[PDB]
Scaffold this active site. Structure first.
Site, PDB file in Angstrom:
ATOM      1  N   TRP A  79     -50.547  58.534 -23.435  1.00 57.59           N
ATOM      2  CA  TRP A  79     -50.311  59.943 -23.186  1.00 57.59           C
ATOM      3  C   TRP A  79     -50.739  60.367 -21.782  1.00 57.59           C
ATOM      4  O   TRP A  79     -50.190  61.315 -21.220  1.00 57.59           O
ATOM      5  CB  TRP A  79     -51.037  60.788 -24.229  1.00 57.59           C
ATOM      6  N   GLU A 120     -44.510  57.916 -22.630  1.00 61.29           N
ATOM      7  CA  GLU A 120     -44.569  59.253 -23.212  1.00 61.29           C
ATOM      8  C   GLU A 120     -44.359  60.359 -22.182  1.00 61.29           C
ATOM      9  O   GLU A 120     -45.296  60.730 -21.475  1.00 61.29           O
ATOM     10  CB  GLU A 120     -45.909  59.466 -23.916  1.00 61.29           C
ATOM     11  N   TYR A 121     -43.144  60.899 -22.101  1.00 59.04           N
ATOM     12  CA  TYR A 121     -42.001  60.461 -22.901  1.00 59.04           C
ATOM     13  C   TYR A 121     -40.751  60.440 -22.033  1.00 59.04           C
ATOM     14  O   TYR A 121     -40.682  61.148 -21.030  1.00 59.04           O
ATOM     15  CB  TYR A 121     -41.766  61.389 -24.098  1.00 59.04           C
TER      16      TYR A 121
HETATM   17  C1  LIG Z   1     -49.484  55.180 -29.618  1.00 59.15           C
HETATM   18  C2  LIG Z   1     -50.280  56.392 -29.408  1.00 59.15           C
HETATM   19  O1  LIG Z   1     -50.911  56.834 -30.298  1.00 59.15           O
HETATM   20  N1  LIG Z   1     -50.244  56.942 -28.227  1.00 59.15           N
HETATM   21  C3  LIG Z   1     -50.778  58.243 -27.924  1.00 59.15           C
HETATM   22  C4  LIG Z   1     -52.200  58.072 -27.439  1.00 59.15           C
HETATM   23  O2  LIG Z   1     -52.071  57.775 -26.076  1.00 59.15           O
HETATM   24  C5  LIG Z   1     -53.102  59.265 -27.765  1.00 59.15           C
HETATM   25  O3  LIG Z   1     -54.448  58.884 -27.637  1.00 59.15           O
HETATM   26  C6  LIG Z   1     -54.989  59.533 -26.528  1.00 59.15           C
HETATM   27  O4  LIG Z   1     -54.919  58.677 -25.407  1.00 59.15           O
HETATM   28  C7  LIG Z   1     -55.462  59.216 -24.228  1.00 59.15           C
HETATM   29  C8  LIG Z   1     -55.130  58.239 -23.153  1.00 59.15           C
HETATM   30  O5  LIG Z   1     -53.730  58.287 -23.076  1.00 59.15           O
HETATM   31  C9  LIG Z   1     -56.943  59.406 -24.460  1.00 59.15           C
HETATM   32  O6  LIG Z   1     -57.550  59.894 -23.292  1.00 59.15           O
HETATM   33  C10 LIG Z   1     -58.779  59.198 -23.137  1.00 59.15           C
HETATM   34  O7  LIG Z   1     -59.821  60.074 -23.460  1.00 59.15           O
HETATM   35  C11 LIG Z   1     -61.089  59.497 -23.407  1.00 59.15           C
HETATM   36  C12 LIG Z   1     -61.975  60.403 -24.211  1.00 59.15           C
HETATM   37  O8  LIG Z   1     -61.226  61.567 -24.509  1.00 59.15           O
HETATM   38  C13 LIG Z   1     -61.355  59.529 -21.933  1.00 59.15           C
HETATM   39  O9  LIG Z   1     -62.644  59.015 -21.653  1.00 59.15           O
HETATM   40  C14 LIG Z   1     -60.389  58.611 -21.233  1.00 59.15           C
HETATM   41  O10 LIG Z   1     -60.458  58.931 -19.847  1.00 59.15           O
HETATM   42  C15 LIG Z   1     -58.945  58.662 -21.728  1.00 59.15           C
HETATM   43  N2  LIG Z   1     -58.479  57.310 -21.719  1.00 59.15           N
HETATM   44  C16 LIG Z   1     -58.172  56.736 -20.601  1.00 59.15           C
HETATM   45  C17 LIG Z   1     -58.852  55.444 -20.339  1.00 59.15           C
HETATM   46  O11 LIG Z   1     -57.392  57.244 -19.848  1.00 59.15           O
HETATM   47  C18 LIG Z   1     -57.056  60.371 -25.621  1.00 59.15           C
HETATM   48  O12 LIG Z   1     -58.398  60.690 -25.913  1.00 59.15           O
HETATM   49  C19 LIG Z   1     -56.433  59.737 -26.856  1.00 59.15           C
HETATM   50  N3  LIG Z   1     -56.565  60.546 -28.042  1.00 59.15           N
HETATM   51  C20 LIG Z   1     -56.931  60.095 -29.224  1.00 59.15           C
HETATM   52  C21 LIG Z   1     -56.849  61.064 -30.332  1.00 59.15           C
HETATM   53  O13 LIG Z   1     -57.303  58.981 -29.410  1.00 59.15           O
HETATM   54  C22 LIG Z   1     -52.932  59.701 -29.222  1.00 59.15           C
HETATM   55  C23 LIG Z   1     -53.052  61.200 -29.471  1.00 59.15           C
HETATM   56  O14 LIG Z   1     -53.109  62.011 -28.285  1.00 59.15           O
HETATM   57  O15 LIG Z   1     -51.750  59.200 -29.841  1.00 59.15           O
HETATM   58  C24 LIG Z   1     -50.577  59.207 -29.063  1.00 59.15           C
HETATM   59  O16 LIG Z   1     -50.352  60.477 -28.498  1.00 59.15           O
END
Ligand SMILES: CC(=O)N[C@@H]1[C@@H](O)[C@H](O[C@@H]2O[C@H](CO)[C@@H](O[C@@H]3O[C@H](CO)[C@@H](O)[C@H](O)[C@H]3NC(C)=O)[C@H](O)[C@H]2NC(C)=O)[C@@H](CO)O[C@H]1O
Ligand SMILES: *[C@@H]1O[C@H](CO)[C@@H](O)[C@H](O)[C@H]1NC(C)=O
Ligand SMILES: *[C@@H]1O[C@H](CO)[C@@H](O)[C@H](O)[C@H]1NC(C)=O
Length: 370
Positions: A79, A120-121
């Site tokens: 995302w 996405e997307y």
């Molecule tokens: C297949 C799928 O589910 N894909 C989507 C996911 O990408 C999404 O999960 C969210 O992902 C983002 C990264 O794209 C997460 O952001 C992370 O957030 C953490 C803490 O919030 C932060 O330290 C990080 O910087 C960041 N990650 C990185 C390394 O960039 C976000 O938190 C995720 N959310 C969840 C609920 O896990 C989820 C839902 O948004 O599913 C799809 O959308």
């Protein structure tokens, strides 16, 4: 033959205390596939997102050493990645092709079993063609590298949205179905902190009082929309969330679905992000006092509230309801987001991995057939 594809997030390893999840904490009999999220693009080449990830790849692989039929995939996109990275990677055939031939080198080097694409997307005609173009090259080159080497083909999967709007804007479903091994439908995030109304993260069926647009924002309608658009049922992996979407109530009195919210609720102590909460954080919230637990018998999912805090999530019951529905519809399996947000430490009071285990024992004996 029901498949269980589990996403493992790389940043869960940076969680504070108990929250911290390593590829060691993965139960290798739980899932059939482990998808590591995410890699990134550096100069349009599939590459590591951090130099700390290189050893992480090595430990998410060699989970196969405890379960030799377990498949380990690398996921790119997400995302946060956005679109622009794929729009670029996808503008010249040389850029694309080279990313393909070399991603194969990248994957085969780390001993990955395949690649998951989570763009996405895509939106618009030119985006649609690019997405087909990309999955085509990947699949056809995997089929080719299987020929030219002496190895079983790399798997190609993709995470796809649930919204019927999103499906039409960027997805040629008959085409991508032809080249994709699995179609991971992200049947969650129907409602969240981006709204000023209380709504459930992942309702199976709709409220009978809902508008005909709201009646389409369900797990049931979305999975059946993909079928309607030409997705083969045995390739459809319906997404199951091990997290809830939280809200801060404008008014402690109004806690019913549709109640006004000012934004996301208190961040979980470990996940550190408002409007969302992991399952082991949910149980904590449930063991608070005057915390009310509601079951929505129309939407077949639970939600809880305390004072101005509202959260809608999935438990052992709602997920088992969803497996009953999934088998009656005849889908090929499930996809989980994420394995590191289920209660892997069994601290809810239930066993270790209460959610994914609940779904697994309910999918037992099931065979995909039409
Ligand atoms: C297949 C799928 O589910 N894909 C989507 C996911 O990408 C999404 O999960 C969210 O992902 C983002 C990264 O794209 C997460 O952001 C992370 O957030 C953490 C803490 O919030 C932060 O330290 C990080 O910087 C960041 N990650 C990185 C390394 O960039 C976000 O938190 C995720 N959310 C969840 C609920 O896990 C989820 C839902 O948004 O599913 C799809 O959308
Ligand atoms: C909360 O909602 C009730 C109606 O459900 C309303 O009467 C009350 O005034 C609201 N609270 C505040 C502080 O206004
Ligand atoms: C919360 O308050 C209600 C009364 O409005 C009461 O029924 C309930 O027992 C209280 N506590 C819990 C844990 O539900």
């Amino acid at each position: 033959e029901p498949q269980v594809l589990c996403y493992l997030t790389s940043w869960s390893s940076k969680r504070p205390s108990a929250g911290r999840f390593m590829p060691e904490n993965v139960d290798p009999t739980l899932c059939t596939h482990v998808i590591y999220a995410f890699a990134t693009l550096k100069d349009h080449k599939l590459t590591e997102a951090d130099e700390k990830d290189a050893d992480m790849y090595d430990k998410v692989v060699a989970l196969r050493e405890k379960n030799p039929n377990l498949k380990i995939l690398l996921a790119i996109g997400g995302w946060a990645f956005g679109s622009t990275p794929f729009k670029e990677l996808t503008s010249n055939v040389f850029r694309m092709n080279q990313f393909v031939y070399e991603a194969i080198e990248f994957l085969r080097d780390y001993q990955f079993n395949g690649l998951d694409v989570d763009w996405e997307y895509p939106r618009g005609a030119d985006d649609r063609a690019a997405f087909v173009s990309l999955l085509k090259e990947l699949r056809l080159a995997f089929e080719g590298e299987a020929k030219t080497s002496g190895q079983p083909r790399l798997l190609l999967t993709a995470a796809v949205p649930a919204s019927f709007e999103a499906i039409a804007a960027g997805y040629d479903v008959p085409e991508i179905s032809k080249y994709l091994d699995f179609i991971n439908v992200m049947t969650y995030d129907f409602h969240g902190q981006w709204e000023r109304q209380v709504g459930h993260n992942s309702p199976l069926f709709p409220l009978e009082s809902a508008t005909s647009y709201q009646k389409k924002l369900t797990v049931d309608y979305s999975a059946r929309e993909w079928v309607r658009q030409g997705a083969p049922k045995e390739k459809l992996m319906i997404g199951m969330p091990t997290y809830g979407r939280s809200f801060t109530l404008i008014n402690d009195t109004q806690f019913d679905i549709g109640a006004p919210a000012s934004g996301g609720g208190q961040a979980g102590r470990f996940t550190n992000e408002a409007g969302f909460m992991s399952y082991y954080e949910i149980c904590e919230f449930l063991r608070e006092d005057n915390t009310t637990l509601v079951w929505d018998n129309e939407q077949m999912v639970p939600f809880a509230y305390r004072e101005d805090q509202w959260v809608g999530f999935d438990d052992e019951r709602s997920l088992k309801t969803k497996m009953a529905w999934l088998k009656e519809e005849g889908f090929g399996g499930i996809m989980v987001w994420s394995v590191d947000m289920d209660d892997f430490r069994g601290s809810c009071g239930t066993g270790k991995y209460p959610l994914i285990t609940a779904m697994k024992q309910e999918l037992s004996g099931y065979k995909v057939k039409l």
